[PDB]
Structures are given as C-alpha cells and as structure tokens.
Scaffold this motif. Sequence first.
Motif, short mmCIF file in Angstrom:
data_model
loop_
_atom_site.label_atom_id
_atom_site.label_comp_id
_atom_site.label_asym_id
_atom_site.label_seq_id
_atom_site.Cartn_x
_atom_site.Cartn_y
_atom_site.Cartn_z
N UNK A 170 0.82 -1.22 0.00
CA UNK A 170 0.00 0.00 0.00
C UNK A 170 0.85 1.27 0.00
N UNK A 171 1.87 1.30 0.86
CA UNK A 171 2.72 2.48 0.96
C UNK A 171 3.49 2.75 -0.35
N UNK A 172 3.94 1.68 -0.99
CA UNK A 172 4.69 1.76 -2.25
C UNK A 172 3.81 2.28 -3.40
N UNK A 173 2.63 1.67 -3.54
CA UNK A 173 1.66 2.07 -4.56
C UNK A 173 1.20 3.52 -4.33
N UNK A 174 0.97 3.89 -3.06
CA UNK A 174 0.59 5.26 -2.74
C UNK A 174 1.65 6.27 -3.19
N UNK A 175 2.92 5.97 -2.91
CA UNK A 175 4.05 6.80 -3.33
C UNK A 175 4.19 6.84 -4.85
N UNK A 176 4.10 5.66 -5.46
CA UNK A 176 4.31 5.51 -6.89
C UNK A 176 3.23 6.20 -7.73
N UNK A 177 1.98 6.18 -7.26
CA UNK A 177 0.85 6.75 -8.03
C UNK A 177 0.26 8.04 -7.47
N UNK A 178 0.83 8.53 -6.36
CA UNK A 178 0.51 9.87 -5.85
C UNK A 178 0.55 10.99 -6.92
N UNK A 179 1.59 11.03 -7.79
CA UNK A 179 1.62 12.15 -8.76
C UNK A 179 0.45 12.14 -9.74
N UNK A 180 -0.28 11.02 -9.79
CA UNK A 180 -1.44 10.91 -10.67
C UNK A 180 -2.76 11.10 -9.94
N UNK A 181 -2.68 11.47 -8.66
CA UNK A 181 -3.89 11.71 -7.87
C UNK A 181 -4.59 10.45 -7.39
N UNK A 182 -3.99 9.29 -7.63
CA UNK A 182 -4.53 8.01 -7.16
C UNK A 182 -4.06 7.76 -5.73
N UNK A 183 -5.01 7.57 -4.82
CA UNK A 183 -4.70 7.37 -3.41
C UNK A 183 -4.91 5.91 -3.03
N UNK A 184 -4.07 5.42 -2.12
CA UNK A 184 -4.07 4.01 -1.73
C UNK A 184 -3.86 4.01 -0.22
N UNK A 185 -4.80 3.43 0.52
CA UNK A 185 -4.74 3.41 1.98
C UNK A 185 -5.11 2.03 2.52
N UNK A 186 -4.71 1.76 3.77
CA UNK A 186 -5.12 0.55 4.47
C UNK A 186 -6.09 0.94 5.58
N UNK A 187 -7.02 0.04 5.89
CA UNK A 187 -7.75 0.10 7.15
C UNK A 187 -7.26 -1.03 8.02
N UNK A 188 -7.07 -0.76 9.30
CA UNK A 188 -6.63 -1.80 10.22
C UNK A 188 -7.66 -2.07 11.32
N UNK A 189 -8.61 -3.01 11.08
CA UNK A 189 -9.59 -3.36 12.13
C UNK A 189 -8.98 -4.16 13.28
N UNK A 190 -9.50 -3.97 14.49
CA UNK A 190 -9.17 -4.85 15.61
C UNK A 190 -10.16 -6.00 15.64
N UNK A 191 -10.56 -6.42 16.84
CA UNK A 191 -11.58 -7.46 17.00
C UNK A 191 -12.98 -6.92 16.65
N UNK A 192 -13.56 -7.48 15.59
CA UNK A 192 -14.83 -7.02 15.02
C UNK A 192 -15.87 -8.14 15.09
N UNK A 193 -17.13 -7.76 15.30
CA UNK A 193 -18.22 -8.73 15.43
C UNK A 193 -18.66 -9.22 14.04
N UNK A 194 -17.93 -10.21 13.52
CA UNK A 194 -18.17 -10.76 12.19
C UNK A 194 -18.24 -12.29 12.25
N UNK A 195 -18.62 -12.95 11.13
CA UNK A 195 -18.77 -14.42 11.07
C UNK A 195 -17.54 -15.19 11.53
N UNK A 196 -16.37 -14.86 10.98
CA UNK A 196 -15.08 -15.48 11.37
C UNK A 196 -14.92 -15.65 12.90
N UNK A 197 -15.35 -14.64 13.65
CA UNK A 197 -15.19 -14.64 15.11
C UNK A 197 -16.40 -15.15 15.89
N UNK A 198 -17.53 -15.32 15.21
CA UNK A 198 -18.81 -15.72 15.84
C UNK A 198 -18.70 -16.92 16.80
#
Lengths: 259, 260, 259, 260
Positions: A170-198
């Motif tokens: 993500x950080x590499x792509x963000x740097x590489x394509x920043x000059x073209x206005x393309x943004x690339x970010x991560x979301x980092x969830x903690x423990x979330x109430x979803x099926x995997x954890x049910x």
Amino acid sequence: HMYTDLKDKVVVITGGSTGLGRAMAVRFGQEEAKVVINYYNNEEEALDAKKEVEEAGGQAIIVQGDVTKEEDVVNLVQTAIKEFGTLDVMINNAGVENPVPSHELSLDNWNKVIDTNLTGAFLGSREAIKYFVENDIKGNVINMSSVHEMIPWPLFVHYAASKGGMKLMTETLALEYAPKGIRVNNIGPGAMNTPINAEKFADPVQRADVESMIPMGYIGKPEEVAAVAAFLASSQASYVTGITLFADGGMTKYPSFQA
Amino acid sequence: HMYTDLKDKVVVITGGSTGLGRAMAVRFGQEEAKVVINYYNNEEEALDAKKEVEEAGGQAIIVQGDVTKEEDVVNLVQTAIKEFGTLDVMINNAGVENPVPSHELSLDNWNKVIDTNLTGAFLGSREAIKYFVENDIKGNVINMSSVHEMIPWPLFVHYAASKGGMKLMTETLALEYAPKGIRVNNIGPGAMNTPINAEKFADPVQRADVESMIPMGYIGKPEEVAAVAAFLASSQASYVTGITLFADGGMTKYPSFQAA
Amino acid sequence: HMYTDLKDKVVVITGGSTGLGRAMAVRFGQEEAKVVINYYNNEEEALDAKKEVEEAGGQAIIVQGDVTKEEDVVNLVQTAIKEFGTLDVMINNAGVENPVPSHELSLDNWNKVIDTNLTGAFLGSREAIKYFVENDIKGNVINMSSVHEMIPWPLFVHYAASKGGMKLMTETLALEYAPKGIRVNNIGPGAMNTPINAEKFADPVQRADVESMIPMGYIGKPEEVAAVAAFLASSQASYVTGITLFADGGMTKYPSFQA
Amino acid sequence: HMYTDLKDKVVVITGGSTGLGRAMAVRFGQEEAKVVINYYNNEEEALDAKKEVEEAGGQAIIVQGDVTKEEDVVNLVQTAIKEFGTLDVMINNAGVENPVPSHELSLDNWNKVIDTNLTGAFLGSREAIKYFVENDIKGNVINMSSVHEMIPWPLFVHYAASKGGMKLMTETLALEYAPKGIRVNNIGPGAMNTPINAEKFADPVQRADVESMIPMGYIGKPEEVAAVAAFLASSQASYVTGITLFADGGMTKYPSFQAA
Ligand SMILES: [Cl-]
Ligand SMILES: [Cl-]
C-alpha cells in the motif's frame, strides 16, 4: 446522505458478501454508490447482501471470483466496467486465517493465506490502478489490513506476514501513483463482530478475554469500519494517502499496559 | 577474535556465496564458527567462499539449494546437522529484485520475489525453529530484510511487500518462541557495496546519486552488515529479540530532509 | 451538513485564529458546532475568524490565552463551560518553530518550542479529560502534530522532539481513558498553505522545492486538514482512538524514493 | 576484552553511579575505556562505581551534576575534556518517573520528568556534538530511552512523552550530523533488574506480573543493556545511526498476544 461526492461512484468490494465487506457494501449503498460485490463461495449470502445495498439506496451486482486466480480479479474489474461504465473505488477485503504453531505450519497453508490476503490485494490493486492510469481517473484503493500489520500474532505467522506485506505494498503504490492523484490506503480493524469470530464470541469466557484486550471495552461493530472506508474513499480524505487507519478501540496501544 | 561464544557454533547462510551472505560467512569464520554456505547455481563462488571461511579461521561446507523449493530448504538444514552435529544460527539471506512499474508487474514476477524473499525465509526460519524446539536449543534466527521493510519502493512493490511481510514474520516468531530462549531478528541493510551492485556503483553519477540518499555519505561495506550479524547471533544480544536493526548510514531517517 | 452529530457540540481550538486552527474553526462552524477560538497575540485576526465561524452557521467566542501558562489553559476550558454549557471536543493546535543548527540551539529556544508545542497540548488534554471524567462525558481530544512526529527534521530538533512526544502523550491518554469512551487522536499535516509558510511559498524556487517533496504534487489546503478533524471528532470515528492520521500528500512515504 | 577500538575512549555517563548507568560504566571499564561518572547526590555510590571501573580495567572520574541544570551539563562535558583530554562517547542515561493519573498530573511534576528525561538528554547530546563538530571527532551519542518510546504508559504520560520526544530528537540529530561521521542512537530497555527496582521485584506476585509482560520470561540484567551500549559505541556499529535498539526480551512485541 453524508459524502455526497460518493453518489454514483463505482465501488468494487472483494469478500463483500459477509462481515466487513458486507458492512462496507451497505454503507456505500447508503451513499448511493454503485457497489460491485465479489464473492467466492456462497451466492445465497451475496444475493442477500445485494438486496441490502439496493434497499440502502444504492445499485449492486454480484460477481463470483477467487482472488487467488488472476483471471478472476481481471474479470471482476472488467465486469465492473461493463456493468457500471467505470471504476472509482477498489476495496480488497477478502481474507482467511487459521491457527497453527509456526514451527508446524505447512507451506501450502502458508501459501493459501499469503495468496489470499496479500497477493489477491496486489492483483486487485494492480488491475484498478492500471485502469486508473490508462483512463486518467483519480481513483482510490482501500486495502483491508488488520491491527496485525503491527501487532505480531503467534499461531498466525502467515496472517501477520500477509498484512505486514500489505502495509508496504500500500505504501509503495501510494508513493508511486501519488503524482497521478490516485490514493491508496489501508484500514486496520481490531476485533470485530463478524462471522469469522462468531465462534469465539459465543463462549462468554472467550468473549470477555477478547474484550479485556480492547481498551474501549467492546468488540467493534462492522459499521464502525465501513465509516472509515466511506471517509477514505471520499474527497474529504483528499490529502490522505499511504496511511494505515486503525479502527481498533485502542488495541494497537498495548492492552497489557492498561492501568 | 571478538565473540568467543560463537566459537564452533553452526551457522547456516542462504545465498552465502556472494555479497552480504559471503561477508557474513567470512565474519563468522573469523569467530571460529562452522559455516554452512547455501548457493543457487554458482559453485565456483561457493567454493571460493568456502576457503575464505577456512582461511579466516573457521570450518565450512557448501550446499546447493533453491529457497523457493521446500525440499532444498529442508535438505539444507538436515545437511548442516548431519555434517556438523547441530544447528545454532539460521541466516535467511537469499533475495531477488527487479524494477517494473507496479500496474505492469506480472503475477509470475510478483510470486518469484515473494517466494524467494519472504516464503524462503519463512521456510528457513521454520526448519531452524523446529530443530531448536525439538532439541531444546536456545538458537538464533537472523532474517535479512532491507530499509525497504520501512521505506516504500516504487517499481519494486514485490520487494517492498516481501520485506514488510518479513518484518511481521520475524516479530511474530520472536514473540511465539521467546519463552523457549529462541531469538529472531531482522537486519535492515541500506545501500551496500556488494558484487551485484558493481554495475551501478562504477558509474560516477549513479554512485553520487546513491550516496546522496545516505546521510553518512558512503555506500556500506558488506563487513559492516556482517558486524551486525555477529552481534545479533552472539550472547551479547541475549535480551534482544523481535527487532529490526537497520545498518543503513541513516537512510531510513528520510534523506530528502537533510539541511542545505 | 456532513456530520449531523457535531451540531451544537462545544469545540475548543487553541491557535484557532490563523492557518489550520482557523480552517478547523470554520469547518466546525459549517457543522453548526459551538467553536471557542483561543488566540495569544492578535485580537483583530481572532475577531475576523469569529465572524467566519458565525457566517458558516456556527456559534463562536474568542478567548485570549498563552498555552504555556497553566492558568490560561484552565481559564480557557472554564470559559468554554461558562459560555456554552459544556465541552465536547478539545483541539490543541498552537505551535511555533524556528531553524537553528542543533549544536547551536539554546536551552531557552528549545524550551519555548517544547513548552508551546508539547506541554501546552498536555495542559489542554489534561483539563479537557479532567472535565470529561468528572462529568461522565464521552469527550474527544485532537492533538495537532506533524509529519515530523515521524520524519526527523534537522535545524528543528526542538519541533521534532515536541511532536514525537505529542505522539506518545496522545497514545498514553488514549489507552488510559479508552475505558471511559474518551478518544484522543493526533493529526499529522505535511506542508500546508498557511501563514507560517507564506514566506517560503512566495519564492517560486522554494515553492517548487517543497512541492518536489510532496508525492501528490501540491501544498496542502488547510480545509483538507479540517476535514480530518471533523471526521475524528465525529461519531463516524467511534472506534478510532490513539492514532496519528497523516494528511500529508504522501510526504511520510519518503519523497526521495519517488520513481 | 571484546571491543579493542574502545580502549582509552572517553565515555561520559549521566546517572552513571546506579542501575543501568553503573553497569555501562563497568562494561566500558572492561573495555579499558576512560569513564566519566555523573551523579546527582549520592557520592558514596559514585565512588563505589568509580572503583568498579578501575578494578574492571579502566580509568574513571566522578562529577556531581543535576541534568536539569544547564551549567551542570556544560561543566560535566568540560570536566571530561579537562581530565582526559577529549570526549568520544556521550551517554545520556539520567531518568526519573512516578505514577499519577494523567488528568491529575501537575504541571510541576510533568516538567520535572520532561526536564530530566528529555531536555537533559538534549543538553548532553548538544554539548557532545558541539565538541565533536569543533574538533572534527567522529563521536558517538547514546541516549537511554525505554520500551515506552513505543509502548504507551498510563499513569506515566510524562515519562512516555519524554521518551517519544527522545526518539525524534535522536533521529533528528543522527540525520543532521551523519555527514560528520557522528552517530546518535537510542537504547530501549525493557524491565531491568536495577537497584531501584528491588522494591517491586522482591515481592513474588509483582515479580511474576512483570515477568508475564516479558516474552523471554526473565527480567533483564543491567549487563545485557551494557552489552548493547558497548556494541553501539564501537566501530562495529559504524553504519548504524538514528536507530532505537530495544533490549526488552520481546516486550515491544505485545505480550498480551502470546499463545496460550
Ligand atoms: Cl526521503
Ligand atoms: Cl500488549
């Protein structure tokens, strides 16, 4: 209607049929976007989600695909362009995990997780950016990471490595394509109430144990993560690229150090 | 010599016949260690490296193996134990790289770099830890990372991902195996004067460009990385685990922000 | 009207009369919040800002205070409670800087910057949280940091240290007060088009040099930072605490490594 | 002894008469260094430390000074140069701490901790770098940080801020002075078995609690931190600058995430 600029944007979401992917599908529907829901395995679930998106005020299709197969990711992006006219937001959300002592972890099991969690996101990111660059679109990529791009995770070395990798991708792509206005970010969830954890969360002893590792004191609701995705995809986040935005109730702040 | 506790320790080094791998092999030779040199195809260099270790004051064998092949990694660690009787220090140093615009990078090219740089180190770390756990050895793993586990790298998204992955891998294994006295660490080399880099670094303008990215103002000598490896492997680093120790002359400190 | 939950919240902003503080003052006015504008030095500027806030749809007062004086920060929070009834969002934005080779930096100059940039934010944070804890309010603190909590800054070692400190202060407070629902976050701006920089940016050679260090290729607009503050103060960021959210056009991604 | 390049180097250590400071003084003594021991008020301990260095094989003076006082820091570095002729390694080790709920922490209490832990190290680093720059010495600064430059610390917001500040201070100075061959680094100790910690660590339940935060399962010995200091000060670390080297037995790797 919060982010008016999201209306009619094309948003592709891998693993969009359940959990966080579904919550994000719904949220972008509430913003009146055009949601492309990728799923691998269970059409009935994906159809149930497609409905929620439509009811929430958005437009939606479902597209079967395995994110570990290049043709499927290429197909998915191409299908989005066929059905809706273009692409604006690419969300790589698909992920798998399983506990194994690291010294006992098989190569095939390591590969399945790396292939799915990291390489799938690379393929997703690549195909979207390729489309963005060729068509002069100031597009947006959101990669679904984890507190475990930062918190090490014994028994889950494959998962941890996949998200640590996703971070630098993500950080590499963000740097590489920043000059073209393309943004690339991560979301980092903690423990979330979803099926995997049910499973874990039904066991009141395990649910309390997980809760004792969250400083805010509750397991995250999937809409709390979808709110972060909405923000990052929106023009409100115009100067925000290459970050990991943790939505974890404080988990990355070291739960063992609570007073 | 410097680290007396390294005398007679068995040290396995993937890609140990050239560049940083070779410099580490020699340094551990200087510490009277028993080195196991892995190489991909160039036997002559491996044999060259073999004698350097011996001439520096250590024992050494060479073993052919491709780190993308599970059997080769398994065979490497098994050979080390057969030949020298045990394993003490595992060094996953093999790495490959090539520049490609990221939206143009092929899946095969991505995989080659991930498989070699990240998965290879997982396989090496796993095989070593397995042996340590089975034989109650308080062993040591050193994974060769890069400033690019922290510094993003346009045109090298596969390389950057592989080392970002390697960081969390190392951190996880250090946490998981710390109760068994097994330490796991990364070294993060900056720009280094390795045989492979001779092409770029001969050209005055390319050498100056690279030097301009280095706050200390010189390209690192492979022995300076080998010095870090020796420290980390020794009992001097007994309380040090799960870290990345950058040996980069300041490169991770953002060289564009140096004062005029 | 984006964040409807912000309407009528009390938002205190140190250094709110110019630059980023002013942009945030205005934005929270657009959300129909009650903005308390702290200023140190220049009432005419603060009055001009108070007007913009009111015009934008909000309510506003101005309060003189030096953030390096404990009584002034205590006064500011107390004034906010007097004038508006309570406190909801505390924004510690005041900051100063000056270039000096580090080996030549005086202790008084080091102290001025530390006192202002870090200790002022501590006092702000303390007084707000004290009020939040005593009155059972799930309040919010935003500390204005910098890319330089992460990017080292030669000639500005005092500034860098102040923001590195702000980072661990924010993270500690976030962990410590998470169980009470009080969230504490940093914003990390890159190069922004504000008064402090107006000198440098007039010189076209210097403006281009600064621009060459921003991957997105432009100097940030102050409203781009205010959008981040709005998000973090809002209930959209409900599971987000202890983070630094960088709004820097990619600057923390290492500008020297651009292809 | 181990680092031959440390022989006769002048090493200044603030708070060098107790705990980690003392262990470093002795270790540098073992390397035949010339140590300058700063102390706040307890002359007996300082004198005790003085003889340990000499008995280990080095030279040593003691010098009284409060690191919150600029003149004392200036006098310390001046004394070192007067007595031993030069300065090679500056170690800013002085630190204080106390638990207070953060919303209750007084401004005076905050300042005492910031002034001692952060500003003191700035003053020491500045005075050392000034000397190095003026005399073309490729000197070395080691700032004593903590796992708490990374791990937040409820009840110790002043301490956490001071070390978070120290991290960017060190990184900045390393970047700024790297062109002059001057290296600047942090050491990040975890829970250490220092005289000061004897109170908590005598009690079995408090000792177990602390040990449960440490993946390696033991409280560090001050000599294990001193080993890091010796490495960083030596030319073995010649390409290492602007880093924090955690010696914490894995503590920064999130101990709550250890497997069952
Ligand atoms: Cl840079
Ligand atoms: Cl933890």
